Amino acid sequence: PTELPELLKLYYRRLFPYSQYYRWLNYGGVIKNYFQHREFSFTLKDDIYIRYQSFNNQSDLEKEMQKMNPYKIDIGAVYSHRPNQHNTVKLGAFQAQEKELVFDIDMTDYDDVRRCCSSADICPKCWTLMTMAIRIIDRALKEDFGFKHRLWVYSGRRGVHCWVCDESVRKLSSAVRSGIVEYLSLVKGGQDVKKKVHLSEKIHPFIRKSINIIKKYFEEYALVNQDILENKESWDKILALVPETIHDELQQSFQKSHNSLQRWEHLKKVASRYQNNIKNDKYGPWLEWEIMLQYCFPRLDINVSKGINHLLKSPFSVHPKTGRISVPIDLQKVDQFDPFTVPTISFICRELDAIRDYKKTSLAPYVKVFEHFLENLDKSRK
Ligand SMILES: Nc1nc(F)nc2c1ncn2[C@@H]1O[C@H](COP(=O)(O)OP(=O)(O)OP(=O)(O)O)[C@@H](O)[C@@H]1O
Ligand SMILES: [Mn+2]
Ligand SMILES: [Mn+2]
Ligand SMILES: [Zn+2]
C-alpha cells in the first residue's frame, strides 16, 4: 500500500473523470449552490480524514483533489450552507437538507449462508448473491416506487452501492427513507436468531416478484455452487428453519438421496404437505420460500440508507484496502459483471504509459456506464 501516493497522483491528474463527476453532482446547475453546498470527506494517509469539504466549481475540486490526493473520497449531503463555512454559521442553523437515497450491501452480512468465503472475502461462487440483490432491489425501486435514476456501483471489495438520484428522492426525510428500507427488508435478526424470514398467508406482490427472481438463480447458485444440502453438517442448518415434526421424514430421505438437487426436491414436496394450521386444510410453499429468501434475498446495511447526512464512498474512488476503483455497474449486463476484472489503480496507471486520459485504459467502459446514467438525468431535465 506504499505505492498508493504516486499512483493516486497520476490517477487524479490524468484519469479521474472530472467533467462527468461535476455533471452528476451539479444536477444541471438549475438549483443555486447545489454543488457548492455538497459535503465531501477526504481520507488521507494513515486513516486521517477531513469532514465538511466543499468547493466552488469543477476547477476548485480538481485543484484540491490533485493537491490532497486522497486515498478515498466520500460524498455526503447537500447542506443549508457551504460545509467549509459551517463554523461561521450560528449554532443549530447548519443542517443537511438533501441527499440521494443510497444503499450499501455487504457480502459479510451473508456469512451465515455462505460456504465459500467469510468476512470481507468474495469469489465467483457467492457473487451471485449480489446479482440477485441488484435485480430484486432495482426492480422494486423502478416498478414499485417509480424511481427512474439509479446508479449501481461496485464498492471495490465486498459488495455494491446504489444511488437513487431523482430530484424528489433527494428531498426525502430520514423517516421516509426508513419506510422504504422496511418495505425492502425481509431477513431480520442477528446471529442470535435461527430463522430470519417469516411470511404471511397472503404474499405481497413485492415478495412474490422477489421470489421469482431468486427462482431463476437458485438451482445453480444454492444447489450446485453452494451445495447447501451436501451433507448432514450443512443440511441440518436448513432443518433449523422448518418445524421439528418433519425433521425425521426429511432426515431419512436426504441420506437416501445423493445430491442437493434431489434433496431440495424432497424438501419442497414435504414442506408443501405440512399442515401449518389445524383449523384449516390450507397448504402451500411458505417454508420453501422462507428458505430461499433467507439464503438469497438482499440484506441491506440499513443505517447507510436511513441517515440523510450519512457518508458513502464516491463512485470512481479507490478502495484503499484492495486498490480497486469503485466502478458503475452496467445494469444491462448485470449477470456478466465480474468484480475480479475490475481494474486497480495500479493496473490502469500501467496501461496509461504502456507502449493520456482514461480512454487509453480499461476504465473507459465504466465511464461509459456513468455517462449513460448522466444522459438520462439530462433528458429528465429538458
Ligand atoms: N468511520 C466512518 N465514518 C464515517 F463517517 N463514514 C464511514 C465510516 N466508515 C465507513 N463510512 C461510510 O459508510 C460506507 C459504507 O461502509 P463500508 O464498510 O460498507 O464501505 P464500502 O465503501 O461500502 O466498501 P466495502 O463495503 O466494499 O468494504 C462507506 O462507503 C462510507 O465511508
Ligand atoms: Mn459496503
Ligand atoms: Mn456497510
Ligand atoms: Zn465466495
PDB file of all heavy atoms in Angstrom, residues 254-276:
ATOM      1  N   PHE A 254     -33.006 -37.547   2.874  1.00  0.00           N
ATOM      2  CA  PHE A 254     -31.748 -36.916   2.483  1.00  0.00           C
ATOM      3  C   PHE A 254     -30.632 -37.951   2.371  1.00  0.00           C
ATOM      4  O   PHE A 254     -29.902 -37.988   1.373  1.00  0.00           O
ATOM      5  CB  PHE A 254     -31.362 -35.825   3.485  1.00  0.00           C
ATOM      6  CG  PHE A 254     -32.170 -34.552   3.365  1.00  0.00           C
ATOM      7  CD1 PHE A 254     -32.077 -33.575   4.343  1.00  0.00           C
ATOM      8  CD2 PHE A 254     -33.009 -34.326   2.283  1.00  0.00           C
ATOM      9  CE1 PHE A 254     -32.805 -32.404   4.250  1.00  0.00           C
ATOM     10  CE2 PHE A 254     -33.740 -33.154   2.185  1.00  0.00           C
ATOM     11  CZ  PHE A 254     -33.636 -32.192   3.169  1.00  0.00           C
ATOM     12  N   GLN A 255     -30.483 -38.801   3.390  1.00  0.00           N
ATOM     13  CA  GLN A 255     -29.452 -39.833   3.348  1.00  0.00           C
ATOM     14  C   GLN A 255     -29.681 -40.804   2.198  1.00  0.00           C
ATOM     15  O   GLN A 255     -28.717 -41.338   1.636  1.00  0.00           O
ATOM     16  CB  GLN A 255     -29.413 -40.580   4.682  1.00  0.00           C
ATOM     17  CG  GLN A 255     -28.905 -39.730   5.841  1.00  0.00           C
ATOM     18  CD  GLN A 255     -29.429 -40.195   7.188  1.00  0.00           C
ATOM     19  OE1 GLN A 255     -30.026 -41.266   7.302  1.00  0.00           O
ATOM     20  NE2 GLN A 255     -29.213 -39.382   8.217  1.00  0.00           N
ATOM     21  N   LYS A 256     -30.942 -41.043   1.830  1.00  0.00           N
ATOM     22  CA  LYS A 256     -31.245 -41.922   0.707  1.00  0.00           C
ATOM     23  C   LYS A 256     -30.978 -41.250  -0.635  1.00  0.00           C
ATOM     24  O   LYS A 256     -30.721 -41.943  -1.626  1.00  0.00           O
ATOM     25  CB  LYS A 256     -32.700 -42.386   0.792  1.00  0.00           C
ATOM     26  CG  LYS A 256     -33.017 -43.157   2.069  1.00  0.00           C
ATOM     27  CD  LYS A 256     -34.438 -43.705   2.081  1.00  0.00           C
ATOM     28  CE  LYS A 256     -34.724 -44.458   3.376  1.00  0.00           C
ATOM     29  NZ  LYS A 256     -36.063 -45.111   3.371  1.00  0.00           N
ATOM     30  N   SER A 257     -31.033 -39.920  -0.689  1.00  0.00           N
ATOM     31  CA  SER A 257     -30.690 -39.183  -1.897  1.00  0.00           C
ATOM     32  C   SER A 257     -29.172 -39.055  -2.011  1.00  0.00           C
ATOM     33  O   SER A 257     -28.420 -39.466  -1.123  1.00  0.00           O
ATOM     34  CB  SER A 257     -31.359 -37.810  -1.893  1.00  0.00           C
ATOM     35  OG  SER A 257     -32.771 -37.927  -1.940  1.00  0.00           O
ATOM     36  N   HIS A 258     -28.710 -38.464  -3.116  1.00  0.00           N
ATOM     37  CA  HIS A 258     -27.285 -38.427  -3.416  1.00  0.00           C
ATOM     38  C   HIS A 258     -26.723 -37.039  -3.698  1.00  0.00           C
ATOM     39  O   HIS A 258     -25.496 -36.897  -3.731  1.00  0.00           O
ATOM     40  CB  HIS A 258     -26.972 -39.333  -4.619  1.00  0.00           C
ATOM     41  CG  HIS A 258     -27.400 -40.756  -4.429  1.00  0.00           C
ATOM     42  ND1 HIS A 258     -27.029 -41.504  -3.332  1.00  0.00           N
ATOM     43  CD2 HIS A 258     -28.164 -41.568  -5.197  1.00  0.00           C
ATOM     44  CE1 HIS A 258     -27.549 -42.715  -3.431  1.00  0.00           C
ATOM     45  NE2 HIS A 258     -28.242 -42.780  -4.554  1.00  0.00           N
ATOM     46  N   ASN A 259     -27.558 -36.022  -3.898  1.00  0.00           N
ATOM     47  CA  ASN A 259     -27.053 -34.678  -4.153  1.00  0.00           C
ATOM     48  C   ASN A 259     -28.105 -33.658  -3.739  1.00  0.00           C
ATOM     49  O   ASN A 259     -29.261 -33.995  -3.473  1.00  0.00           O
ATOM     50  CB  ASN A 259     -26.663 -34.501  -5.625  1.00  0.00           C
ATOM     51  CG  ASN A 259     -27.797 -34.829  -6.572  1.00  0.00           C
ATOM     52  OD1 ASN A 259     -28.943 -34.445  -6.344  1.00  0.00           O
ATOM     53  ND2 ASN A 259     -27.482 -35.549  -7.642  1.00  0.00           N
ATOM     54  N   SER A 260     -27.678 -32.392  -3.692  1.00  0.00           N
ATOM     55  CA  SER A 260     -28.548 -31.327  -3.204  1.00  0.00           C
ATOM     56  C   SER A 260     -29.775 -31.144  -4.085  1.00  0.00           C
ATOM     57  O   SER A 260     -30.853 -30.808  -3.583  1.00  0.00           O
ATOM     58  CB  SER A 260     -27.768 -30.014  -3.115  1.00  0.00           C
ATOM     59  OG  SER A 260     -26.835 -30.045  -2.048  1.00  0.00           O
ATOM     60  N   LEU A 261     -29.635 -31.345  -5.396  1.00  0.00           N
ATOM     61  CA  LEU A 261     -30.778 -31.182  -6.288  1.00  0.00           C
ATOM     62  C   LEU A 261     -31.911 -32.123  -5.896  1.00  0.00           C
ATOM     63  O   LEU A 261     -33.072 -31.708  -5.811  1.00  0.00           O
ATOM     64  CB  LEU A 261     -30.351 -31.416  -7.738  1.00  0.00           C
ATOM     65  CG  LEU A 261     -31.439 -31.216  -8.797  1.00  0.00           C
ATOM     66  CD1 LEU A 261     -31.987 -29.796  -8.765  1.00  0.00           C
ATOM     67  CD2 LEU A 261     -30.901 -31.548 -10.181  1.00  0.00           C
ATOM     68  N   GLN A 262     -31.590 -33.396  -5.644  1.00  0.00           N
ATOM     69  CA  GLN A 262     -32.611 -34.355  -5.235  1.00  0.00           C
ATOM     70  C   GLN A 262     -33.166 -34.017  -3.858  1.00  0.00           C
ATOM     71  O   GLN A 262     -34.375 -34.127  -3.623  1.00  0.00           O
ATOM     72  CB  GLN A 262     -32.030 -35.770  -5.228  1.00  0.00           C
ATOM     73  CG  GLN A 262     -31.515 -36.259  -6.570  1.00  0.00           C
ATOM     74  CD  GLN A 262     -30.692 -37.532  -6.444  1.00  0.00           C
ATOM     75  OE1 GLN A 262     -30.558 -38.095  -5.355  1.00  0.00           O
ATOM     76  NE2 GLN A 262     -30.134 -37.988  -7.558  1.00  0.00           N
ATOM     77  N   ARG A 263     -32.296 -33.612  -2.932  1.00  0.00           N
ATOM     78  CA  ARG A 263     -32.736 -33.349  -1.567  1.00  0.00           C
ATOM     79  C   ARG A 263     -33.619 -32.111  -1.490  1.00  0.00           C
ATOM     80  O   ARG A 263     -34.555 -32.072  -0.682  1.00  0.00           O
ATOM     81  CB  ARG A 263     -31.519 -33.214  -0.651  1.00  0.00           C
ATOM     82  CG  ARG A 263     -30.781 -34.531  -0.439  1.00  0.00           C
ATOM     83  CD  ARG A 263     -29.677 -34.418   0.603  1.00  0.00           C
ATOM     84  NE  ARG A 263     -28.346 -34.436   0.001  1.00  0.00           N
ATOM     85  CZ  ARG A 263     -27.588 -35.521  -0.139  1.00  0.00           C
ATOM     86  NH1 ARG A 263     -28.014 -36.705   0.280  1.00  0.00           N
ATOM     87  NH2 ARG A 263     -26.393 -35.420  -0.702  1.00  0.00           N
ATOM     88  N   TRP A 264     -33.350 -31.099  -2.319  1.00  0.00           N
ATOM     89  CA  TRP A 264     -34.226 -29.932  -2.365  1.00  0.00           C
ATOM     90  C   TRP A 264     -35.603 -30.306  -2.893  1.00  0.00           C
ATOM     91  O   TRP A 264     -36.624 -29.839  -2.375  1.00  0.00           O
ATOM     92  CB  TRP A 264     -33.601 -28.840  -3.232  1.00  0.00           C
ATOM     93  CG  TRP A 264     -34.439 -27.605  -3.333  1.00  0.00           C
ATOM     94  CD1 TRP A 264     -35.097 -27.144  -4.440  1.00  0.00           C
ATOM     95  CD2 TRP A 264     -34.715 -26.670  -2.286  1.00  0.00           C
ATOM     96  NE1 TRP A 264     -35.759 -25.980  -4.145  1.00  0.00           N
ATOM     97  CE2 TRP A 264     -35.544 -25.669  -2.828  1.00  0.00           C
ATOM     98  CE3 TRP A 264     -34.342 -26.584  -0.941  1.00  0.00           C
ATOM     99  CZ2 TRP A 264     -36.005 -24.592  -2.073  1.00  0.00           C
ATOM    100  CZ3 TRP A 264     -34.800 -25.512  -0.194  1.00  0.00           C
ATOM    101  CH2 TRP A 264     -35.621 -24.533  -0.761  1.00  0.00           C
ATOM    102  N   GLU A 265     -35.651 -31.152  -3.925  1.00  0.00           N
ATOM    103  CA  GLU A 265     -36.930 -31.588  -4.470  1.00  0.00           C
ATOM    104  C   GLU A 265     -37.751 -32.319  -3.415  1.00  0.00           C
ATOM    105  O   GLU A 265     -38.979 -32.188  -3.372  1.00  0.00           O
ATOM    106  CB  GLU A 265     -36.698 -32.483  -5.686  1.00  0.00           C
ATOM    107  CG  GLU A 265     -37.622 -32.196  -6.860  1.00  0.00           C
ATOM    108  CD  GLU A 265     -37.449 -30.794  -7.410  1.00  0.00           C
ATOM    109  OE1 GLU A 265     -36.290 -30.360  -7.582  1.00  0.00           O
ATOM    110  OE2 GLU A 265     -38.471 -30.122  -7.663  1.00  0.00           O
ATOM    111  N   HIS A 266     -37.088 -33.093  -2.551  1.00  0.00           N
ATOM    112  CA  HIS A 266     -37.799 -33.784  -1.481  1.00  0.00           C
ATOM    113  C   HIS A 266     -38.291 -32.805  -0.425  1.00  0.00           C
ATOM    114  O   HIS A 266     -39.381 -32.980   0.132  1.00  0.00           O
ATOM    115  CB  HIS A 266     -36.897 -34.840  -0.845  1.00  0.00           C
ATOM    116  CG  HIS A 266     -36.835 -36.122  -1.613  1.00  0.00           C
ATOM    117  ND1 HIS A 266     -37.910 -36.979  -1.716  1.00  0.00           N
ATOM    118  CD2 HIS A 266     -35.827 -36.698  -2.309  1.00  0.00           C
ATOM    119  CE1 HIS A 266     -37.568 -38.025  -2.447  1.00  0.00           C
ATOM    120  NE2 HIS A 266     -36.310 -37.879  -2.820  1.00  0.00           N
ATOM    121  N   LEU A 267     -37.498 -31.774  -0.125  1.00  0.00           N
ATOM    122  CA  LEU A 267     -37.921 -30.794   0.869  1.00  0.00           C
ATOM    123  C   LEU A 267     -39.156 -30.037   0.402  1.00  0.00           C
ATOM    124  O   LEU A 267     -40.052 -29.743   1.199  1.00  0.00           O
ATOM    125  CB  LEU A 267     -36.781 -29.822   1.170  1.00  0.00           C
ATOM    126  CG  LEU A 267     -37.123 -28.739   2.193  1.00  0.00           C
ATOM    127  CD1 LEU A 267     -35.952 -28.493   3.125  1.00  0.00           C
ATOM    128  CD2 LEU A 267     -37.526 -27.446   1.499  1.00  0.00           C
ATOM    129  N   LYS A 268     -39.222 -29.711  -0.892  1.00  0.00           N
ATOM    130  CA  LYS A 268     -40.372 -28.979  -1.408  1.00  0.00           C
ATOM    131  C   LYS A 268     -41.647 -29.804  -1.292  1.00  0.00           C
ATOM    132  O   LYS A 268     -42.707 -29.272  -0.942  1.00  0.00           O
ATOM    133  CB  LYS A 268     -40.127 -28.574  -2.861  1.00  0.00           C
ATOM    134  CG  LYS A 268     -39.104 -27.461  -3.020  1.00  0.00           C
ATOM    135  CD  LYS A 268     -39.058 -26.930  -4.445  1.00  0.00           C
ATOM    136  CE  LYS A 268     -38.560 -27.980  -5.420  1.00  0.00           C
ATOM    137  NZ  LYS A 268     -38.433 -27.427  -6.796  1.00  0.00           N
ATOM    138  N   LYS A 269     -41.566 -31.104  -1.581  1.00  0.00           N
ATOM    139  CA  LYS A 269     -42.753 -31.948  -1.508  1.00  0.00           C
ATOM    140  C   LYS A 269     -43.246 -32.087  -0.074  1.00  0.00           C
ATOM    141  O   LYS A 269     -44.450 -31.978   0.187  1.00  0.00           O
ATOM    142  CB  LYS A 269     -42.462 -33.321  -2.114  1.00  0.00           C
ATOM    143  CG  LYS A 269     -42.304 -33.296  -3.629  1.00  0.00           C
ATOM    144  CD  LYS A 269     -42.080 -34.687  -4.210  1.00  0.00           C
ATOM    145  CE  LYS A 269     -41.930 -34.633  -5.728  1.00  0.00           C
ATOM    146  NZ  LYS A 269     -41.739 -35.982  -6.331  1.00  0.00           N
ATOM    147  N   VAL A 270     -42.333 -32.322   0.869  1.00  0.00           N
ATOM    148  CA  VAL A 270     -42.726 -32.436   2.270  1.00  0.00           C
ATOM    149  C   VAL A 270     -43.267 -31.104   2.780  1.00  0.00           C
ATOM    150  O   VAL A 270     -44.318 -31.051   3.428  1.00  0.00           O
ATOM    151  CB  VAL A 270     -41.539 -32.921   3.121  1.00  0.00           C
ATOM    152  CG1 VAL A 270     -41.926 -32.998   4.595  1.00  0.00           C
ATOM    153  CG2 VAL A 270     -41.052 -34.277   2.626  1.00  0.00           C
ATOM    154  N   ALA A 271     -42.559 -30.009   2.490  1.00  0.00           N
ATOM    155  CA  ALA A 271     -42.941 -28.713   3.038  1.00  0.00           C
ATOM    156  C   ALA A 271     -44.327 -28.292   2.565  1.00  0.00           C
ATOM    157  O   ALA A 271     -45.099 -27.702   3.331  1.00  0.00           O
ATOM    158  CB  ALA A 271     -41.901 -27.660   2.657  1.00  0.00           C
ATOM    159  N   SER A 272     -44.662 -28.579   1.309  1.00  0.00           N
ATOM    160  CA  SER A 272     -45.961 -28.199   0.770  1.00  0.00           C
ATOM    161  C   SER A 272     -47.088 -29.117   1.228  1.00  0.00           C
ATOM    162  O   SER A 272     -48.244 -28.876   0.864  1.00  0.00           O
ATOM    163  CB  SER A 272     -45.910 -28.169  -0.761  1.00  0.00           C
ATOM    164  OG  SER A 272     -45.602 -29.445  -1.289  1.00  0.00           O
ATOM    165  N   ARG A 273     -46.785 -30.156   2.004  1.00  0.00           N
ATOM    166  CA  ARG A 273     -47.805 -31.001   2.611  1.00  0.00           C
ATOM    167  C   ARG A 273     -47.848 -30.859   4.124  1.00  0.00           C
ATOM    168  O   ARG A 273     -48.677 -31.503   4.774  1.00  0.00           O
ATOM    169  CB  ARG A 273     -47.575 -32.469   2.236  1.00  0.00           C
ATOM    170  CG  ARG A 273     -47.612 -32.727   0.739  1.00  0.00           C
ATOM    171  CD  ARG A 273     -47.730 -34.211   0.432  1.00  0.00           C
ATOM    172  NE  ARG A 273     -46.792 -35.011   1.218  1.00  0.00           N
ATOM    173  CZ  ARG A 273     -45.626 -35.478   0.773  1.00  0.00           C
ATOM    174  NH1 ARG A 273     -45.228 -35.240  -0.472  1.00  0.00           N
ATOM    175  NH2 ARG A 273     -44.856 -36.194   1.581  1.00  0.00           N
ATOM    176  N   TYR A 274     -46.977 -30.038   4.701  1.00  0.00           N
ATOM    177  CA  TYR A 274     -47.034 -29.759   6.128  1.00  0.00           C
ATOM    178  C   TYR A 274     -48.271 -28.931   6.446  1.00  0.00           C
ATOM    179  O   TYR A 274     -48.545 -27.923   5.787  1.00  0.00           O
ATOM    180  CB  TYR A 274     -45.774 -29.015   6.565  1.00  0.00           C
ATOM    181  CG  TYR A 274     -45.792 -28.577   8.010  1.00  0.00           C
ATOM    182  CD1 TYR A 274     -45.677 -29.504   9.039  1.00  0.00           C
ATOM    183  CD2 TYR A 274     -45.912 -27.236   8.346  1.00  0.00           C
ATOM    184  CE1 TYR A 274     -45.689 -29.105  10.365  1.00  0.00           C
ATOM    185  CE2 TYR A 274     -45.926 -26.828   9.665  1.00  0.00           C
ATOM    186  CZ  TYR A 274     -45.815 -27.766  10.671  1.00  0.00           C
ATOM    187  OH  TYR A 274     -45.825 -27.363  11.986  1.00  0.00           O
ATOM    188  N   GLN A 275     -49.025 -29.358   7.454  1.00  0.00           N
ATOM    189  CA  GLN A 275     -50.178 -28.593   7.912  1.00  0.00           C
ATOM    190  C   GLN A 275     -49.696 -27.516   8.876  1.00  0.00           C
ATOM    191  O   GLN A 275     -49.301 -27.819  10.006  1.00  0.00           O
ATOM    192  CB  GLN A 275     -51.206 -29.499   8.578  1.00  0.00           C
ATOM    193  CG  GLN A 275     -52.280 -28.718   9.314  1.00  0.00           C
ATOM    194  CD  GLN A 275     -53.649 -29.356   9.213  1.00  0.00           C
ATOM    195  OE1 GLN A 275     -53.820 -30.540   9.499  1.00  0.00           O
ATOM    196  NE2 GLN A 275     -54.638 -28.569   8.802  1.00  0.00           N
ATOM    197  N   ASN A 276     -49.720 -26.259   8.432  1.00  0.00           N
ATOM    198  CA  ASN A 276     -49.303 -25.163   9.298  1.00  0.00           C
ATOM    199  C   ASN A 276     -50.367 -24.825  10.333  1.00  0.00           C
ATOM    200  O   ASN A 276     -50.032 -24.425  11.453  1.00  0.00           O
ATOM    201  CB  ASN A 276     -48.980 -23.917   8.467  1.00  0.00           C
ATOM    202  CG  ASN A 276     -47.548 -23.905   7.954  1.00  0.00           C
ATOM    203  OD1 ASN A 276     -46.635 -23.448   8.642  1.00  0.00           O
ATOM    204  ND2 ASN A 276     -47.349 -24.396   6.734  1.00  0.00           N
TER     205      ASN A 276
END
